[PDB]
Amino acid sequence: RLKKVEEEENAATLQLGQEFQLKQINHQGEEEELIALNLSEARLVIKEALVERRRAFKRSQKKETREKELESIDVLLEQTTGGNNKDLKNTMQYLTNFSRFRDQETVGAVIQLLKSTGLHPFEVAQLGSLACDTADEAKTLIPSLNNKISDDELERILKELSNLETLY
Amino acid sequence: NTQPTIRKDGLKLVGSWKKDRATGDADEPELRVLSTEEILNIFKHISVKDFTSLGF
Amino acid sequence: DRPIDDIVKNLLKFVVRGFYGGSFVLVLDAILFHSVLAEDDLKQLLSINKTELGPLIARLRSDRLISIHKQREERVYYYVKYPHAIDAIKWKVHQVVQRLKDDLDKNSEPNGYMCPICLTKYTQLEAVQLLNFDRTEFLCSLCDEPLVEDDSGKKNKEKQDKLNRLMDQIQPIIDSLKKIDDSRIEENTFEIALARLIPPQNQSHAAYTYNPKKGSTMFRPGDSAP
Amino acid sequence: PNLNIVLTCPECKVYPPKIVERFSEGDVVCALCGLVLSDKLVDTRSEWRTFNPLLDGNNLSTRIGKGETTDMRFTKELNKAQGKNVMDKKDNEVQAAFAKITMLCDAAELPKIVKDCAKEAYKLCHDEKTLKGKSMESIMA
Amino acid sequence: HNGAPHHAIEEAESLLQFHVATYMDNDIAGQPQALQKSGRPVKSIRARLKGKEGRI
Amino acid sequence: MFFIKDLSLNITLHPSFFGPRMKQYLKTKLLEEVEGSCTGKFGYILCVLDYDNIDIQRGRILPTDGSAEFNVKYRAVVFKPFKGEVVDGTVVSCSQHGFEVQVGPMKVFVTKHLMPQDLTFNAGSNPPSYQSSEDVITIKSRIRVKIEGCISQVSSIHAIGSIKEDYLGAI
Ligand SMILES: [Zn+2]
């Protein structure tokens, strides 16, 4: 419709995507907000669905250990699909190498903090995806971190986020 | 300004602006060929709500 | 008259002198040295032909410089609308600046790759997927032929130097435009140029008089103001 | 670009392949294997059943006139406008020479082949410094 | 582009409009006919898409 | 990046597979054509969420062919590329005009004019590496790269990257 130009540069400074709006609608008729997921929690949540579909397949023929997981889901994925998803093995390797916390309960306690703080969702999802510890060099690296958030409050949440995460 | 009285002719258009602006009645129209440039520019200077009224 | 108007006259003079052919220079210098001209008087004064007069008048139409006048005493007259000339020059210099800046910005980036068989342009990011199986040559989709890089990455400094030298040449014009912006923009008419009539000859058959008819109720394009 | 389609059976490859055309169904088959190559042939006779460009050259000749659902007031304008582009081409002089050699050959009752060969002989040179005018009729003679 | 004597240019641009109109359709109000050689008229698009097996 | 969204996808099925156990067959189907897929709209599609209580509920037989289609609404994990984000990806292959960093699904490449000139490039390296203090392409090859734009096209997706920023590149 009139070529629908809508020229937006994508940036971390609330310069959003053209399809990835904050507000959508869902199939039930209720309002579907935007969902963003960090690197640590994404790596944690994918294994739930992985073991769920593996035991689901095991029931079909009936009717955190990442060193295990990198070969294990390779075997599961080559069992059902082909061996073309070396790209997916690389994506999950990225998900498991550089996520900020290896375990699950530290990320869960971080989420239990964030549900009470009520921070900006895309901002804190970017913070969870990135792996840093001090807020001023995080600011000098990312101008969104420079301008959106005060450094003192960023540091006072960064230390109680960074104490939980396993250091590398 | 006025609109000129427009007579369809052949494969073009002409207009005779009567326009009657002297001290007398001044019935003196000039028959000038309606140049497709000036029709294009005056079409380019129309409002979108005028297009909706005019069925465009 | 206005010394800024004299600066404008010398500005138009220098624009044609440094950026147009000598026939254009002679035509504009004649019509500034004198005033509004019949074509016959100009053809006498320069001893030229209408075949030579044609493309000069046409290009001066094309740059929106000469304001023609047509009236019967039919007699052809020529002048220059000052704000039309100023705004045409302003759009010309702004288009030169933006076009040369974007051309310099594109040319500062490296070349791409050239296929001598099909003789077509290609870019580096288009050639990213044009690598072969062994990363040796850049494979062609049609010709199956290696792709070789252009010579334009060293034309970055050439476009930069052309922009800088042209900017230095137009810097008197930029300063004159600044002084015009300091001053007041004024609109020419045929009768205004008639008030500065500088007599070329003594036997001009075309009388240099603006004589509209009674009941001249027409508003004409290029001849009125909002 | 090399502008080239070559047809080859993908299962025999003995040569540029010994293939045949079945025009009654418009298909092509490698005669050894018996597999199709392509389908829906375009006819090569029906266009000649449907309806001098080499002598008139690449530019194409056009005579214009009147019809039934037209007006005499503008077909006379057309009759005086048909010569407004004859000076753009030298083909007005080419067709004047063609008309005059038609005058000559049919005056001497010469056939169509003699007429077209004289047209060819003019169209061959038609312009040299050796030609140089020479009364314009010596070249046609 | 070259020296226009302001008589041929108007009838020339009228010819341009005439030929694009004739190519567009040749069933116009019959002031021209505008055929091309030979004596059969040039078949324009309303002739291509008219009734009686005109493409529809 | 790694995101969750509701997605509805339509799939079809051959009429010879009209046996009693086709719901699980459709499920298996949904796994191989969801897995290993990169789209332009949502980047690469990783895997599926909420395997149980999936909604298919109805299908239509095509009128001209016995094949029947089925729309599937589901939750999934997908990767969405973006512009201007520092990531610590890994490098597998390198070229003389620039290294090819494999950050997850992409192969983000930095062209010869986007490496900083104060980086001490050596041509005599196998693979050719751009190292100054510690940013060496290794078996780990963790290099801080910023994708300032991922150029999605006809579906051979490539991202552009740069290390022309302080602490970017070096680790
Ligand atoms: Zn064969």
Swiss-Prot record, chain A:
Q: SMART domains this protein is in?
A: RPOL4c
For this protein, the record's SUPFAM superfamilies field holds:
HRDC-like (SSF47819)
Q: Where does the record place it? A: Nucleus; Cytoplasm; Cytoplasm, P-body
User: Which BP terms in the Gene Ontology apply to this protein?
Assistant: DNA-templated transcription initiation; mRNA processing; nuclear-transcribed mRNA catabolic process, deadenylation-dependent decay; positive regulation of translational initiation; RNA-templated transcription; transcription by RNA polymerase II; transcription elongation by RNA polymerase II; transcription initiation at RNA polymerase II promoter
> How is this protein annotated for GO cellular component?
cytoplasm; nucleus; P-body; RNA polymerase II, core complex; RPB4-RPB7 complex
Q: What Pfam families does the entry give?
A: RNA_pol_Rpb4
Q: Which UniProt keywords apply?
A: Acetylation, Cytoplasm, DNA-directed RNA polymerase, mRNA processing, Nucleus, Phosphoprotein, Transcription
Q: Which PANTHER family match?
A: DNA-DIRECTED RNA POLYMERASE II (PTHR21297)
Question: What role is this protein assigned?
Answer: DNA-dependent RNA polymerase catalyzes the transcription of DNA into RNA using the four ribonucleoside triphosphates as substrates. Component of RNA polymerase II which synthesizes mRNA precursors and many functional non-coding RNAs. Pol II is the central component of the basal RNA polymerase II transcription machinery. It is composed of mobile elements that move relative to each other. RPB4 is part of a subcomplex with RPB7 that binds to a pocket formed by RPB1, RPB2 and RPB6 at the base of the clamp element.
Q: Which family does it belong to?
A: Belongs to the eukaryotic RPB4 RNA polymerase subunit family.
From Swiss-Prot, chain B:
Record's subcellular location: Nucleus
- The signal peptide annotation in the UniProt record is none
Its PTM note reads: The tandem 7 residues repeats in the C-terminal domain (CTD) can be highly phosphorylated. The phosphorylation activates Pol II. Phosphorylation occurs mainly at residues 'Ser-2' and 'Ser-5' of the heptapeptide repeat. The phosphorylated form of Pol II appears to carry, on average, one phosphate per repeat. The phosphorylation state is believed to result from the balanced action of site-specific CTD kinases and phosphatases, and a 'CTD code' that specifies the position of Pol II within the transcription cycle has been proposed.
Question: Its biological function?
Answer: DNA-dependent RNA polymerase catalyzes the transcription of DNA into RNA using the four ribonucleoside triphosphates as substrates. Largest and catalytic component of RNA polymerase II which synthesizes mRNA precursors and many functional non-coding RNAs. Forms the polymerase active center together with the second largest subunit. Pol II is the central component of the basal RNA polymerase II transcription machinery. During a transcription cycle, Pol II, general transcription factors and the Mediator complex assemble as the preinitiation complex (PIC) at the promoter.
Q: Which family does it belong to?
A: Belongs to the RNA polymerase beta' chain family.
Instruction: Please identify the protein, giving its name as recorded.
Output: DNA-directed RNA polymerase II subunit RPB1
The residues of the intact protein that this chain contains are 169 to 224 of 1733
UniProtKB/Swiss-Prot annotation, chain C:
Query: What's the source species' lineage?
Result: Eukaryota, Fungi, Dikarya, Ascomycota, Saccharomycotina
Taxonomy, superkingdom: Eukaryota
Note on file? Present with 35900 molecules/cell in log phase SD medium.
Q: Which family does it belong to?
A: Belongs to the TFIIE alpha subunit family.
Which cell locations does it reside in? Nucleus
Residues of the HTH TFE/IIEalpha-type domain: 8-90
Q: What organism is recorded for this protein? A: Saccharomyces cerevisiae (strain ATCC 204508 / S288c)
> What's this protein's name?
Transcription initiation factor IIE subunit alpha
Q: What is this protein's function? A: Recruits TFIIH to the initiation complex and stimulates the RNA polymerase II C-terminal domain kinase and DNA-dependent ATPase activities of TFIIH. Both TFIIH and TFIIE are required for promoter clearance by RNA polymerase.
The shown range, given as first to last of full length, is 2 to 235 of 482
Q: What's the encoding gene here?
A: TFA1
- What is known about its subunit structure? TFIIE is a tetramer of two alpha (TFA1) and two beta (TFA2) subunits.
UniProtKB/Swiss-Prot annotation, chain F:
User: Listed GO molecular functions?
Assistant: single-stranded DNA binding; single-stranded RNA binding; translation initiation factor binding
Keyword Chloroplast set for record: no
Q: Which InterPro entries match?
A: NA-bd_OB-fold (IPR012340), RNA_pol_Rpb7-like_N_sf (IPR036898), Rpb7-like (IPR045113), Rpb7-like_N (IPR005576), S1_domain (IPR003029)
Q: What is its main location?
A: nucleus
Record keyword Electron transport present: no
Q: Where in the cell is it found?
A: Nucleus; Cytoplasm; Cytoplasm, P-body
What residue stretch is flagged as signal peptide?
none
State the superkingdom.
Eukaryota
Q: Which SUPFAM superfamilies match?
A: N-terminal, heterodimerisation domain of RBP7 (RpoE), Nucleic acid-binding proteins
Biological processes per GO annotation: DNA-templated transcription initiation; nuclear-transcribed mRNA catabolic process; nuclear-transcribed mRNA catabolic process, deadenylation-dependent decay; positive regulation of nuclear-transcribed mRNA poly(A) tail shortening; positive regulation of translational initiation; RNA-templated transcription; transcription by RNA polymerase II; transcription elongation by RNA polymerase II
Record keywords: Cytoplasm, DNA-directed RNA polymerase, Nucleus, Transcription
Give the CC-aspect GO terms.
Answer: cytoplasm; nucleus; P-body; RNA polymerase II, core complex; RPB4-RPB7 complex
Q: Partners and quaternary state?
A: Component of the RNA polymerase II (Pol II) complex consisting of 12 subunits. RPB4 and RPB7 form a subcomplex that protrudes from the 10-subunit Pol II core complex. The RPB4-RPB7 subcomplex probably associates with TFG1. Interacts with NRD1 and PAT1.
Query: Could you say which protein family the record assigns here?
Result: Belongs to the eukaryotic RPB7/RPC8 RNA polymerase subunit family.
What's the encoding gene here?
RPB7
